Design a protein around this ligand. Structure first.
Ligand SMILES: OC[C@H]1O[C@H](O[C@H]2[C@H](O)[C@@H](O)[C@H](OCCCCCCCC3CCCCC3)O[C@@H]2CO)[C@H](O)[C@@H](O)[C@@H]1O
Ligand SMILES: CCCCCCCCCCCCCCCCCCCC
Ligand SMILES: CCCCCCCCCCCCCCCCCCCC
Ligand SMILES: CCCCCCCCCCCCCCCCCCCC
Lengths: 95, 504, 100, 612, 473, 168
C-alpha cells in the first residue's frame, strides 16, 4: 500500500545519486569544461526544486484561483528566462 | 534686532576672504580686517544706543535688545539672541581681539591666506554667538561650531614644538577635550528641557522658560555638574587644563590671542548666566569645591608657569592662575566679586592678548621660544623689551592697570564672604610676582645671551607698535577710570546676583 | 506519542553536531557539509512544530528552508571549485590575508 | 594751593617724556628734564606750603574724581594736604630734587641715562601719590608704584645676575608686606566700609562697641605692611642686598622715601592703633629689636654702602620706637632730620666709592682726609648727626625728643635699649669713617668740583647740622597727639645721650685710628670670629628664609616641572590606546575563529536570557 | 486572503524592481552591453521610487499575511532604493576599469535591493527570512566580484560561510519560537516563556551578525576591505538600513519586545558595539577597515534608540532621522573611496596615506570627504550630529544612563580618529575622470554632503517628514 | 507510527555524528544521505508527507547529489587523506566539542520548559500545504524563485573560470 511509494522514492533518489556520481566520473575525464559541467548540474538541481513548487501548485489548482495561476505563470516564465540565461552563457558548448 | 548681523558679518566675512584670495595674495587679510572693523563698529553702536548705565535689577530676563525666530519648532527650539551689559562687553572685547588677531598675523604666511583668515572669522563669529545666544540649542551649537575651525587653525598653521608634539596632536587634545565636555553639557540641557516639559507639557529649549523649572534636589545638582564640567574644561579649572599649555604652545599667534583672550572668558560667562540662574540652589551648595579648585588653580598655575622653559607655555599657565581667581569670585555671592570678575576678565583679556602678540614678534625676530637661549635681550630691540616689561608688570596685580582693579575688587568681596580663602589667594598674588618677574628676567635681563642668536635685532614695525600701544593705553585707562565698565556691566551683574541669592 | 519536546531535542542535537563539525573541519567541503546539516536541522524543527500545531506552515517554511539550502550549495560549491584551482586541499585557514 | 596735582603731574610728565626718549637725548637734556620736572615740583610744594601756612593751617582736601564705585564700596581719587602731608611732601620734592642733581652728575656717560631718570621721575610721582593718600587704596597705588620703581632702580644694572636677584629679593619681600597691608584693607572695609582715614577713625569707635578683636587684626596688618616697606623685622632681609643699586638710588629710596613710607602710614593711622594698645606696643618693640640687631651688624660690614644700609635699618628702628610709644611728632621730626643726613651720607658715599675707582671696600681704601676735603668733611658732619653729637647736629635733637617720649611714658626699657643703640651707632659709624679717611692711604684718590655735585653736598651738609633742627613740622594742626613732656629729667637724659655719644666717638678713635691691634687680635679669637660672621650675615635671617621658603618653593617647582595632573588625565587616553590594540587582536582573518566566536556569543546570549 | 488591484499598487516598487531584474537579465543574455544594462537598471530603480509616490497616493493596506505597506515601509524602501541607485552610479566607472564581464553586477544589485524591500515591507516571520536571503545571496557574489585578488576571494568565502551560519541560527530560532508559539506574524509573539526567549536569542545571534553587533562583528573589516569599494557602499548602507527597518518593526509589534531579559542582552550588546567599535577603529591606516569598525559602533548608537522604543514614540522618529543622516554620510565617504579607486586598476585606495593634501589636486573630493568625516563623528553642522542628538534625547528621556555615557565616551574616541583623517586630507600632498560616468558618482557624493550640511543646519524638513511615516499599531 | 520515529531519529543522529568524524568525503556524503533519509522517515512519523517525500526526492535527491557530482568531478576526495587525518585529533576537537555540548545543553534545557501537549501524527495532504503555499504565501513562491536565480547568477560569476592559460 504505502511502503511501495517509499520504495520508488528511495529508489528514485538512489538512482539520481549513482547516475550523478557516474556523470561526475565522466566529467573528470569563455569558460572551461568543468565550469560548464557544474553550471549545468546546478541548473538541474534548480529545475528540480522549482518543479517541486510546480507540483505543489498542481495538487490544488481551482482552489488557488486566477491569482494562483498567474503566479504559476510568472514563476515558470522566470525559471525559463533562467534557462535562456544559462544557454546564452555558453555552458552548452560542451557537457 | 541687530544680533544676527553681528554673527553674520564675521561669517560672510570669512566666506569673502576665501573667495577673494584668488584676486590677490594680499587681499584676504584686508577683508578680514575691514569686516572686523564693521563688527566692532556695530558692537560700539549697540553700546551707544542702549543706556551706558542701565537699570540695575529689573529681573533676570532683561535685555537692551532681543531677537527671536523659529528654527526647530518641532522641539520648541528657535534662534534666540539676547544682549546684556555683560554680553555687550564680551562682544566688544571679542571684536577688538579680532582686529588684533588679524593684525598680529599680518606677517605670517603658510598654505593659503584665504583659508587662514576664513577659519579665523568662523572662530571669532561663532564665539560672539556663544555670547549672544540664549536659546540653549543655538548656544551649544555655536559652542562646538567654533571648536572645529579653531582645531583647523592649530593643526594647519601652528609651529611644531620643542617637545616633539606635532601641531595636529595639540589640535587633537584641545578638540577632544572641549568637544566631549560639550557632550556632557548637552546631555544636561537634554535632561533639563525634558524635566521642564515633563512638568508643564511644553518642549522649549529657551533660557527664560527653563528657569521656571521645578526640580528634585539632587537632579538640579547633576544637571549643574554637567554644565560645570563643560565650563571647567574650557575655563579651565584644574585637572582639565593641559590642553591649554599644549594648544598655546602649538597655536599660531592669532590662535593664542583669541584662545587666551576669549574662549576661557566664554567658559566663565556661561558659568554666570547658565550655571547659576538655571541652578541657583545646587550652585550655592557647590561654591565650596568651586572656590577651592579656584585656589588650587591660582597656585598650581603659578608654579607650572614659573617652572616653564618655553615662553608661550608660561604665559598660558598665567591665564590658568588668574581664571582660578575668577572661578572663586563667582561662587561668592558678592556683587562686588562679580564686578571684579567682569572688569578683570576683560582686563586679563587685554593683558594676555598683549603678551602673546609680543611673544609673537619676539619669535618673528629670534626664531625661538626657549628662554634658555635668550637673555639681556633688552640691548637688542627697541620696544619689545619694555612693552613686554609693562605687560609683565600688569600681569601681576599692579595698580595703574585693570588687572589690579578687578583682582582686588574680587578679593574684597570674596573676603566679605569667605576670608580664609581670600587671604590664601592673595598669597597667590605673591607667586604672581615671582613668575611674571622670572619670565621678564629670562627674556630681557642678564647675560647678553645663551645663544648666538642675540645681536642687534630689527625694529618694531608701525603695526606692532601702534597695536601694542593701543592695548597699553586700554589697560592704563581701565586701571585709572573703570566707571564706564563697572556701569555697563552693573545692570546684568546686579540681575544675576540678586537671582542667585534670592533663589536660595 | 508525539512529545514536542523530543522532536525539538532532536532538531537541537543535530544543529549542534553540524555546527561542531563546521568548526572542527578545515576542508571547505566539510564545512559546507556542516552548513547543510544545520539548515536541515532547522527546517526539521520547523516541520516538527508544524506537526504539534495542525498547520501547513511548518511545511511551507521547510520548503523555503530547502530552497535556501539549494541556493547556498550552488554558490558555495561554485566557490569551492573556484578555489580548487587555487589550493589542492581546500584547507580553509590558508585564507588569512586580511587581519586587524 | 590747589595745585596739589602738579606735585604728581610734573614727575609723571617728566617720566613719560624720558621713557619715550631712549638715548636719543644728550645726557645734558635728559638731565635737564629729569632733574627739572622734580625741581618744579619742589617749587610747587613751596608755593602750596606757603599758601597753606598763610591760609592758617586749614586741612586742604582736593577731590580729583572717584576712582571707582560699587554699592557699598566707594573709593575716590582725592588729595589730602595737611601738616603731616606737607612734611612728607616737602621732604620728598626737596631731598628728591637734591639727589636728582647729584645723580645728574653721578650718572654721566652710562647705560641708559634717560632710563634712570625716567624711573626716578616715576619714583617721585609714586611717592607723592602715596603721601596725598585720601583713602588707603589710592595710597596702595602709592605703595605699589613705589615698590615697583624701587625694583627697577635696584635692578637697574641688569647685565649682572647678582644685581637683578637683589632687585627680585626686594620686589618679592616688599610684596609679601604689601599682602599683609592688603588684609588690613579688606578687614577695615568689611568692618567700616569707607577706607578713608578720618571716617575710619570715627566709625571706628562707633562700630567697634565690642572691638579689640577685629580692629586688632586690621592694625596689626597695617603694621605687617609698614614693617615690609620700612625694612623692619622680620621683612628686613631685603635691605642689605638693596645696595646693589646706583648710589643716588641708595639715597632716594634709603633716606627720604620707602622706609619713611612705612613709618608715615603707621602715623596716619595713629587713631586706629591707639584704639589697639598692644599692637602699638609691638610697633615699639620691633622698632627696638631692629635698631639693635641692625646696629650690631652694621658694625661688621666691610662695605661702605652696606654699613650705611644697616644704618638706615637701625635708624628706621628708632623711628618705629618713637611711634611705638606715642611720640608721633618725635618720630616724624626724626624722619626729616634723617632724610637730611642720610641723603648726605649716601651722596658722599657715592663721591667716595667713585673717587676710589669703584673700590667700595673700606680696607682697600684709607687716608682720604687730605685727598678729598669736601667729602671727608661731609662724612664728619653727617656721621656726627647720625651719631647724635650733643650740639651742631639735628640728629641729637631727634634721638632726644624720641627718648623724651620713651622715658616720658614709663617705657624705660625701650629707652635704655635705644641708648645702648646710640652707643652702637656712634661706634660703627666712626669705625667706618676713621677706617675710610684716616690711616694708610692705599688707593690714591683725587677730587673734582662741579655745581651739580658740590652744591647738593653743601646744602645737605648745612641742613644735616643743627641748622637742620631749626625746621619744625606742623604736626599740631593735623591733630596727632602731643608727646607727654618731661623736665629736669630732660637734662639728665639729654646729657646721658650726649655722654654716650661722645664716649662712643672717642672709643672709635682709640679702637681703629692706631694699629687696630686690639680689634684685630679680638677678631681672630674664636668667639669674636663666630659673632663676626653672625652679624656680618644679617644675623642668619637670609639663611632661615632661604631654607624654609625659597628652597622648598623651588623644590615644588622642580617636583612638578611636568603637570602630574595632565598625566593623571592622560591615563584614560592610554587605557583606551592599549585597549585598542588589545581588542584589535581578535581580527585575525581566521574564518574558523570567527565561527567559533559566533558559537560562543550565542552561548552567552542564551545563558543570559535564561538567567534573566 | 488574496490580492486585489489595491495590493498591486501597494506592491508597486517591488513589482517594478522584479521586472527590471528579469528584463535586464534577458538583455544581458542577448547582447552583453554595459552602458545599456546599467541605464536600464537605473531607469528601473528611479521607476520604483516614483512608484513609491503612487503608493503614497494609495492606502496603508496589507498585501498578504506576510506584509504591511505604510509610511514606515515607504521611508525604508525610499532609502534602500537611494542606496542601490547610488551604488550603481558608483560601480560604473570602477567596473569600466574591470576587464571581465561587468553586467552580472547590476543584477546582483537589483536582486539584493528587491530583498531589502521585502524587509522594509515584511510583517510575517517567513517574509523576514526570505528578505535576508535576498539581502545575502547576491551580496556573496558582490563581495567576490573581483575574485582575482586573494583578498576579494578570501572575503567572499568568509562572508558567505559565516553569512550562511547566521541564516542558519536565525532559521533554527524562528523554528524554536514558532514551535513554542503557534504563529508566524510579529504581533503574535506567542501570547517570558523559556523556549520563546531562547529561539528569540538565536534570532538575535543572526540579526546581530547581519548588523555587525558585537560579539558577531568580526567579519566586518575583512569584508569591507576585501570587496570592491562600491559593494562596500551598498554593504553598509542598503543592507544595514533595511535589516534594521525589519528589526525595529519586529521588536515593535512583537509583544515580547517589551521584555526585560531581551532589553538587557540588547543594551549590553549595543554598549559593547559602540565601545569596541571606536576602540578597534583608532589604530587603523586602512580607510575601509576604519569605516567598518566605525559601522559596528554606529549600529551600537541606533541599537540605543531601539532599546528605548517602548518608552516614547519619538524613538522611532530619531531612528529615521539618524538613518537618513547615516545614509548620506556613508554614501559620501565610501563614495569618495570607490570613486578614488576610479577605473578598476588593481587594488583599491585602502591606505589613508593616499589621502593627504589630496585637496591640493583633488579639492572637492577632499571637502566632501571631510564634511562627511565630521558628520560621521557627531559634530554640529552635520546630520551626524542631529542624529547623535536624537539618540541622546531618546537616551535620557527613556532613562538609559550607562548606554548614554557610552555614547558620549565613544563620540570622543571617534573625535580622535575621524578628526585625524580629515586633517590628513589637509596635510601636504605626496609626490607623483574624462568620462561622464565618473561625474555621476561625483555629483552624487557632492549632493550627499550638501544634504548633511543643509540638513545638518536646518533639520525641520527631514524631521517632520520622518515624523510623518509611522507604522500601523 | 511511534517507535519508528525514535529509531529513525537515533539512527540519523548516529549517521550525522559519523559524517562529522570521517575523512573520506564519499563516506561522508553517503552518511549525510543516510541521515537525511532517516529524517525523511521521522518527517513521516509526524504525518509531514509532502515534507518527508520532498526530502527524499529533493534534498537527498538532487542537492546531496550535486555535491557528490562535484566531489567526483573534482575527484579531490581520496588524496590528502592523511593530511585530513592530521586535523581531527583530541587536542583540536575537544574545545569546540565542549562549547557546542554546552550550547546544546542550554538549548535543550530551554526546550524542556514549553508545554508539550503531545499531538497525534495526523497526516497532512500535500494538496493542503499547496493550498497554503499558493494562497497565504503567494509572494513567497514568487520570491524563492528569485533566491534560486540569484543563487545561479553568482554561482556562474564565481564557479566559472576563464581561460587564463592562453597567453597574450
Ligand atoms: O637677569 C638675571 C637672570 O634672570 C634669569 O635667571 C633667573 C633670575 O636671575 C632669577 O632672579 C629668577 O628668579 C628665581 C626665583 C627663586 C625664588 C622665587 C620666590 C620664592 C618665594 C618663597 C616664599 C613665598 C614667595 C616666593 O629666576 C631666573 C632663573 O630661573 C635669566 O634666565 C638669566 O639669563 C638672567 O641672567
Ligand atoms: C573641573 C572640576 C571637575 C570636578 C568634577 C567632580 C565634582 C565632584 C563633586 C562631588 C560632590 C559630593 C558632595 C557630597
Ligand atoms: C525616503 C522615503 C521617505 C518616504 C516617507 C513616506 C511618508 C508617507 C506618509 C503617508 C501618510 C498617510
Ligand atoms: C576624561 C573622560 C571623561 C568621561 C566622562 C563620562 C561621563 C559619563 C556620564 C554619564 C551620565 C549618565
Amino acid at each position: 500500500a504505502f511502503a511501495i511509494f517509499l520504495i520508488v522514492a528511495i529508489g528514485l533518489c538512489c538512482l539520481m545519486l549513482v547516475g550523478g556520481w557516474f556523470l561526475g566520473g565522466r566529467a573528470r575525464a569563455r569558460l572551461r569544461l568543468s565550469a560548464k559541467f557544474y553550471l549545468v548540474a546546478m541548473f538541474f538541481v534548480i529545475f528540480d526544486v522549482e518543479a517541486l513548487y510546480l507540483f505543489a501548485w498542481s495538487t490544488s489548482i481551482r482552489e488557488s484561483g486566477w491569482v494562483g495561476f498567474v503566479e504559476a505563470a510568472i514563476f515558470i516564465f522566470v525559471l525559463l528566462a533562467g534557462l535562456v540565461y544559462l544557454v546564452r552563457i555558453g555552458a552548452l558548448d560542451w557537457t | 534686532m541687530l544680533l544676527p548681523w553681528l554673527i553674520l558679518i564675521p561669517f560672510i566675512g570669512g566666506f569673502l576672504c576665501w573667495q577673494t584670495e584668488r584676486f590677490g595674495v594680499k587681499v584676504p587679510r584686508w577683508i578680514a580686517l575691514i569686516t572686523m572693523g564693521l563688527t566692532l563698529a556695530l558692537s560700539l553702536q549697540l553700546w551707544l544706543q542702549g543706556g551706558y548705565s542701565l537699570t540695575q535689577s529689573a529681573g533676570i530676563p532683561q535685555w537692551q535688545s532681543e531677537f527671536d525666530m523659529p528654527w526647530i519648532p518641532r522641539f520648541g527650539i528657535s534662534i534666540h539672541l539676547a544682549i546684556d551689559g555683560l554680553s555687550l562687553l564680551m562682544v566688544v572685547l571679542t571684536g577688538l581681539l579680532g582686529v588684533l588677531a588679524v593684525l598680529c598675523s599680518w606677517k605670517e604666511i603658510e598654505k593659503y591666506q584665504g583659508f587662514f583668515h576664513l577659519n579665523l572669522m568662523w572662530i571669532l563669529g561663532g564665539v560672539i554667538g556663544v555670547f549672544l545666544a540664549i536659546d540653549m540649542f543655538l548656544f551649544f551649537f555655536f559652542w562646538e561650531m567654533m571648536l572645529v575651525p579653531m582645531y583647523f587653525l592649530i593643526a594647519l598653521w601652528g609651529h611644531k614644538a620643542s617637545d616633539g608634539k606635532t601641531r595636529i596632536t595639540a589640535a587633537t587634545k584641545f578638540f577632544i577635550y572641549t568637544q566631549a565636555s560639550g557632550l556632557v553639557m548637552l546631555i544636561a540641557i537634554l535632561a533639563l528641557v525634558f524635566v521642564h516639559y515633563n512638568a508643564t507639557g511644553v518642549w522649549t529649549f529657551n533660557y527664560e522658560e527653563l528657569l521656571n523649572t521645578p526640580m528634585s534636589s539632587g537632579v538640579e545638582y547633576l544637571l549643574m555638574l554637567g554644565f560645570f564640567i563643560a565650563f571647567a574644561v574650557k575655563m579651565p579649572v584644574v585637572p582639565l587644563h593641559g590642553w591649554l599649555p599644549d594648544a598655546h604652545s602649538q597655536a599660531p599667534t592669532a590662535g593664542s590671542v583669541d584662545l587666551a583672550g576669549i574662549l576661557l572668558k566664554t567658559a566663565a560667562y556661561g558659568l554666570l548666566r547658565f550655571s547659576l540662574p538655571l541652578f541657583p540652589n545646587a550652585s550655592a551648595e557647590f561654591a565650596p569645591i568651586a572656590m577651592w579648585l579656584g585656589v588650587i588653580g591660582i597656585f598650581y598655575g603659578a608654579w607650572m608657569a614659573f617652572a616653564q622653559t618655553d615662553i608661550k607655555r608660561l604665559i598660558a599657565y598665567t591665564s590658568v592662575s588668574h581664571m582660578g581667581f575668577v572661578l572663586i569670585a563667582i561662587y561668592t555671592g558678592s556683587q562686588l566679586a562679580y564686578q571684579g570678575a567682569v572688569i578683570q576678565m576683560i582686563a586679563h583679556g587685554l593683558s594676555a592678548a598683549g603678551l602673546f602678540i609680543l611673544c609673537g614678534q619676539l619669535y618673528e625676530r629670534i626664531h625661538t621660544r626657549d628662554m634658555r637661549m635668550m637673555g639681556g635681550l633688552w640691548s637688542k630691540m627697541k620696544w619689545l623689551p619694555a612693552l613686554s616689561l609693562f605687560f609683565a608688570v600688569a600681569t601681576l596685580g599692579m595698580p595703574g592697570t585693570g588687572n589690579f582693579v578687578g583682582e582686588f575688587m574680587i578679593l574684597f568681596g570674596s573676603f566679605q564672604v569667605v576670608p580664609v580663602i581670600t587671604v590664601i589667594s592673595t598669597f597667590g598674588l605673591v607667586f604672581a610676582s615671582v613668575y611674571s618677574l622670572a619670565m621678564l628676567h629670562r627674556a630681557y635681563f642678564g647675560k647678553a645671551k645663551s645663544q648666538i642668536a642675540s645681536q642687534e635685532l630689527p625694529g618694531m614695525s608701525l603695526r606692532e607698535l601702534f597695536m601694542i600701544l593701543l592695548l597699553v593705553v586700554l589697560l592704563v585707562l581701565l586701571g585709572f577710570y573703570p566707571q564706564p565698565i563697572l556701569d555697563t556691566s552693573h545692570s546684568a551683574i546686579g540681575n544675576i546676583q540678586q537671582w542667585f541669592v534670592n533663589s536660595v | 506519542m508525539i512529545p514536542l519536546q523530543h522532536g525539538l531535542i532532536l532538531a537541537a542535537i543535530l544543529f549542534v553536531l553540524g555546527l561542531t563539525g563546521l568548526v572542527i573541519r578545515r576542508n571547505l567541503l566539510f564545512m559546507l557539509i556542516g552548513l547543510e546539516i544545520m539548515i536541515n536541522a532547522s527546517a526539521l524543527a520547523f516541520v516538527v512544530a508544524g506537526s504539534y500545531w495542525g498547520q501547513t506552515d511548518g511545511q511551507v517554511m521547510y520548503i523555503l528552508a530547502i530552497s535556501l539550502a539549494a541556493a547556498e550549495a550552488s554558490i558555495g560549491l561554485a566557490l569551492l571549485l573556484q578555489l580548487h584551482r587555487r589550493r589542492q586541499n581546500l584547507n580553509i585557514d590558508s585564507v588569512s590575508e586580511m587581519r586587524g | 594751593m590747589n595745585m596739589l596735582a602738579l606735585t604728581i603731574i610734573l614727575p609723571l610728565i617728566g617720566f613719560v617724556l624720558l621713557a619715550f626718549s631712549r638715548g636719543r637725548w644728550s645726557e645734558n637734556v635728559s638731565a635737564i628734564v629729569g632733574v627739572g620736572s622734580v625741581g618744579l615740583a619742589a617749587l610747587v610744594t613751596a608755593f602750596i606750603g606757603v599758601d597753606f601756612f598763610a591760609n592758617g593751617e586749614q586741612t586742604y582736601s582736593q577731590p580729583l574724581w572717584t576712582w571707582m564705585s560699587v554699592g557699598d564700596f566707594n573709593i575716590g581719587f582725592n588729595l589730602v594736604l595737611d601738616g603731616l602731608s606737607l612734611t612728607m611732601l616737602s621732604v620728598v620734592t626737596g631731598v628728591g630734587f637734591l639727589i636728582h642733581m647729584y645723580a645728574s652728575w653721578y650718572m654721566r656717560g652710562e647705560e641708559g641715562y634717560s632710563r634712570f631718570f625716567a624711573y626716578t621721575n616715576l619714583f617721585i610721582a609714586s611717592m607723592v601719590v602715596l603721601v596725598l593718600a585720601d583713602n588707603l587704596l589710592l595710597m596702595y597705588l602709592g605703595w605699589e608704584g613705589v615698590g615697583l620703581c624701587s625694583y627697577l632702580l635696584i635692578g637697574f644694572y641688569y647685565t649682572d645676575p647678582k644685581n637683578g636677584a637683589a632687585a627680585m629679593k626686594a620686589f618679592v619681600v616688599t610684596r609679601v608686606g604689601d599682602v599683609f597691608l592688603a588684609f588690613a584693607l579688606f578687614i577695615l572695609y568689611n568692618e567700616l566700609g569707607t577706607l578713608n582715614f578720618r571716617e575710619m577713625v570715627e566709625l571706628a569707635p562707633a562700630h567697634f562697641a565690642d572691638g579689640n578683636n577685629m580692629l586688632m587684626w586690621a592694625t596689626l596688618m597695617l603694621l605687617g605692611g609698614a614693617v615690609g616697606k620700612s625694612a623692619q623685622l622680620p621683612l628686613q632681609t631685603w635691605l642689605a642686598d638693596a645696595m646693589a643699586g646706583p648710589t643716588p638710588v641708595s639715597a632716594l629710596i634709603h633716606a627720604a622715601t620707602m622706609v619713611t613710607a612705612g613709618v608715615y602710614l603707621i602715623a596716619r593711622t595713629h587713631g586706629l592703633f591707639l584704639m589697639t594698645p598692644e599692637v602699638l606696643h609691638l610697633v615699639g618693640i620691633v622698632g627696638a629689636v631692629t635698631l639693635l640687631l641692625a646696629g650690631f651688624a652694621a658694625l661688621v660690614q666691610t662695605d661702605i654702602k652696606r654699613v650705611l644700609a644697616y644704618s638706615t635699618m637701625s635708624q628706621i628702628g628708632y623711628m618705629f620706637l618713637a611711634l611705638g610709644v606715642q611720640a608721633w611728632d618725635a618720630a616724624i621730626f626724626h624722619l626729616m632730620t634723617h632724610a637730611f643726613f642720610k641723603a648726605l651720607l649716601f651722596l658722599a658715599s657715592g663721591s667716595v666709592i667713585l673717587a676710589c675707582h669703584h673700590e667700595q671696600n673700606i680696607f682697600k681704601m684709607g687716608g682720604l682726609r687730605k685727598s678729598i676735603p669736601l667729602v671727608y668733611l661731609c662724612f664728619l658732619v653727617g656721621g656726627a648727626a647720625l651719631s647724635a653729637l650733643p650740639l651742631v647736629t639735628a640728629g641729637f635733637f631727634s634721638k632726644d625728643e624720641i627718648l623724651a617720649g620713651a622715658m616720658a611714658n614709663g617705657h624705660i626699657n625701650l629707652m635704655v635699649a635705644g641708648l645702648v643703640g646710640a652707643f652702637m651707632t656712634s661706634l660703627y659709624t666712626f669705625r667706618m669713617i676713621f677706617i675710610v679717611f684716616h690711616g694708610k692711604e692705599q688707593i690714591h684718590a683725587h677730587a673734582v668740583k662741579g655745581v651739580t655735585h658740590s652744591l647738593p653736598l653743601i646744602v645737605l651738609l648745612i641742613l644735616s647740622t643743627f641748622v637742620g633742627a631749626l625746621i619744625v613740622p606742623p604736626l599740631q594742626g593735623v591733630l596727632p597727639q602731643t608727646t607727654e613732656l618731661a623736665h629736669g629729667s630732660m637734662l639728665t637724659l639729654e646729657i646721658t645721650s650726649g655722654v654716650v655719644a661722645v664716649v662712643g666717638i672717642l672709643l672709635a678713635a682709640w679702637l681703629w685710628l692706631g694699629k687696630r691691634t686690639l680689634v684685630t687680635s679680638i677678631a681672630n679669637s674664636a668667639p669674636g670670629r663666630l659673632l663676626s660672621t653672625w652679624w656680618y650675615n644679617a644675623w642668619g635671617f637670609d639663611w632661615l628664609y632661604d631654607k624654609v621658603f625659597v628652597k622648598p618653593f623651588l623644590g615644588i617647582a622642580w617636583l612638578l616641572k611636568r603637570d602630574p595632573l595632565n598625566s593623571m588625565m592622560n591615563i584614560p587616553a592610554v587605557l583606551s590606546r592599549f585597549a585598542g590594540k588589545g581588542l584589535l587582536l581578535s581580527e585575525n582573518g581566521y574564518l574558523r575563529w570567527y565561527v567559533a566566536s559566533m558559537s560562543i556569543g550565542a552561548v552567552v546570549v542564551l545563558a543570559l536570557l535564561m538567567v534573566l | 486572503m488574496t490580492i486585489t488591484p489595491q495590493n498591486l499598487i501597494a506592491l508597486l516598487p517591488l513589482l517594478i524592481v522584479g521586472l527590471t531584474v528579469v528584463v535586464v537579465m534577458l538583455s544581458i543574455a542577448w547582447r552583453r552591453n554595459h552602458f545599456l544594462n546599467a541605464t536600464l537598471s537605473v531607469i528601473g530603480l528611479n521607476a520604483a521610487l516614483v512608484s513609491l509616490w503612487f503608493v503614497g497616493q494609495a492606502g496603508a493596506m496589507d498585501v498578504t499575511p506576510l506584509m504591511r505597506v505604510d509610511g514606515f515601509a515607504m521611508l525604508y524602501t525610499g532609502l534602500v532604493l537611494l542606496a542601490s541607485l547610488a551604488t550603481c552610479t558608483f560601480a560604473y566607472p570602477w567596473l569600466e576599469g574591470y576587464n571581465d564581464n561587468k553586467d552580472e553586477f547590476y543584477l546582483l544589485v537589483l536582486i539584493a535591493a528587491l530583498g531589502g524591500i521585502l524587509l522594509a515591507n515584511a510583517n510575517h516571520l517567513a517574509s523576514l527570512f526570505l528578505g535576508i536571503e535576498l539581502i545575502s545571496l547576491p551580496l556573496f557574489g558582490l563581495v567576490g566580484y573581483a575574485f582575482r585578488q586573494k583578498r576579494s576571494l578570501e572575503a567572499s568565502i568568509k562572508y558567505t560561510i559565516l553569512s550562511a551560519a547566521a541564516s542558519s541560527f536565525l532559521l533554527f530560532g524562528m523554528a524554536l519560537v514558532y514551535a513554542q508559539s503557534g504563529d508566524l506574524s510579529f504581533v503574535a509573539l506567542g501570547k517570558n516563556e523559556p523556549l520563546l526567549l531562547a529561539g528569540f536569542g538565536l534570532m538575535i545571534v543572526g540579526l546581530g551578525f547581519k548588523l555587525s553587533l558585537v560579539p558577531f562583528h568580526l567579519w566586518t573589516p575583512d569584508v569591507y576591505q576585501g570587496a570592491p569599494a562600491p559593494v562596500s557602499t551598498f554593504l553598509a548602507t542598503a543592507s544595514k538600513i533595511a535589516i534594521f527597518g525589519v528589526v525595529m518593526r519586529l521588536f515593535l509589534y512583537a509583544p515580547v519586545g517589551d521584555s526585560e531579559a531581551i532589553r538587557v542582552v540588547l543594551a549590553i550588546i549595543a554598549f559593547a558595539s559602540i565601545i569596541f567599535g571606536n576602540l578597534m577603529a583608532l589604530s587603523q591606516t586602512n580607510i575601509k577597515r576604519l569605516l567598518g569598525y566605525s559601522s559596528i559602533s554606529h549600529l551600537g548608537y541606533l541599537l540605543v534608540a531601539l532599546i528605548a522604543l517602548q518608552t516614547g514614540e519619538m524613538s522611532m522618529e530619531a531612528v529615521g532621522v539618524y538613518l537618513a543622516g547615516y545614509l548620506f554620510s556613508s554614501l559620501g565617504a565610501f563614495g569618495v573611496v570607490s570613486l578614488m579607486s576610479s577605473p578598476y586598476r588593481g587594488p583599491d585606495a585602502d591606505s589613508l596615506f593616499s589621502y593627504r593634501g589630496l585637496f591640493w589636486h583633488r579639492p572637492i573630493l577632499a571637502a566632501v570627504m571631510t564634511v562627511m568625516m565630521l558628520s560621521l563623528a557627531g559634530i554640529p553642522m552635520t546630520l551626524g550630529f542631529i542624529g547623535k542628538f536624537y539618540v541622546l534625547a531618546v537616551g535620557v528621556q527613556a532613562h538609559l544612563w550607562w548606554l548614554v555615557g557610552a555614547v558620549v565616551v565613544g563620540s570622543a574616541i571617534g573625535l580622535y580618529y575621524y578628526l585625524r583623517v580629515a586633517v590628513s586630507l589637509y596635510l601636504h600632498a605626496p609626490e607623483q575622470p574624462s568620462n561622464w560616468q565618473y561625474s555621476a558618482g561625483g555629483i552624487v557624493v557632492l549632493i550627499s554632503a550638501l544634504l548633511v550640511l543643509v540638513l545638518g543646519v536646518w533639520p525641520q524638513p527631514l524631521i517632520s517628514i520622518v515624523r510623518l511615516a509611522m507604522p500601523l499599531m | 507510527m511511534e517507535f519508528a520515529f525514535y529509531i529513525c531519529g537515533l539512527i540519523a543522529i548516529l549517521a550525522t555524528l559519523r559524517v562529522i568524524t570521517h575523512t573520506n568525503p564519499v563516506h561522508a556524503l553517503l552518511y549525510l544521505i543516510i541521515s537525511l533519509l532517516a529524517i525523511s522517515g521521522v518527517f513521516f512519523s509526524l504525518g509531514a508527507y509532502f515534507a518527508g517525500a520532498l526530502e527524499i526526492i529533493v534534498y537527498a535527491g538532487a542537492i546531496m547529489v550535486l555535491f557528490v557530482f562535484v566531489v567526483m568531478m573534482l575527484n579531490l576526495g581520496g588524496s590528502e587523506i592523511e593530511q585530513e587525518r592530521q586535523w581531527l585529533k583530541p587536542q583540536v576537537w575537544i574545545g569546540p566539542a565542549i562549547l557546542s555540548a554546552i550550547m546544546l545543553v542550554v538549548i535543550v534545557y530551554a526546550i524542556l520548559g514549553v508545554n508539550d501537549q503531545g499531538i497525534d501524527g495526523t497526516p497532512i495532504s500535500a494538496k493542503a500545504v499547496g493550498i497554503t503555499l499558493f494562497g497565504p504565501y503567494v509572494l513567497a513562491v514568487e520570491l524563492a524563485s528569485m533566491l534560486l536565480l540569484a543563487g545561479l547568477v553568482v554561482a556562474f560569476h564565481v564557479g566559472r573560470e576563464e581561460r587564463a592559460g592562453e597567453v597574450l
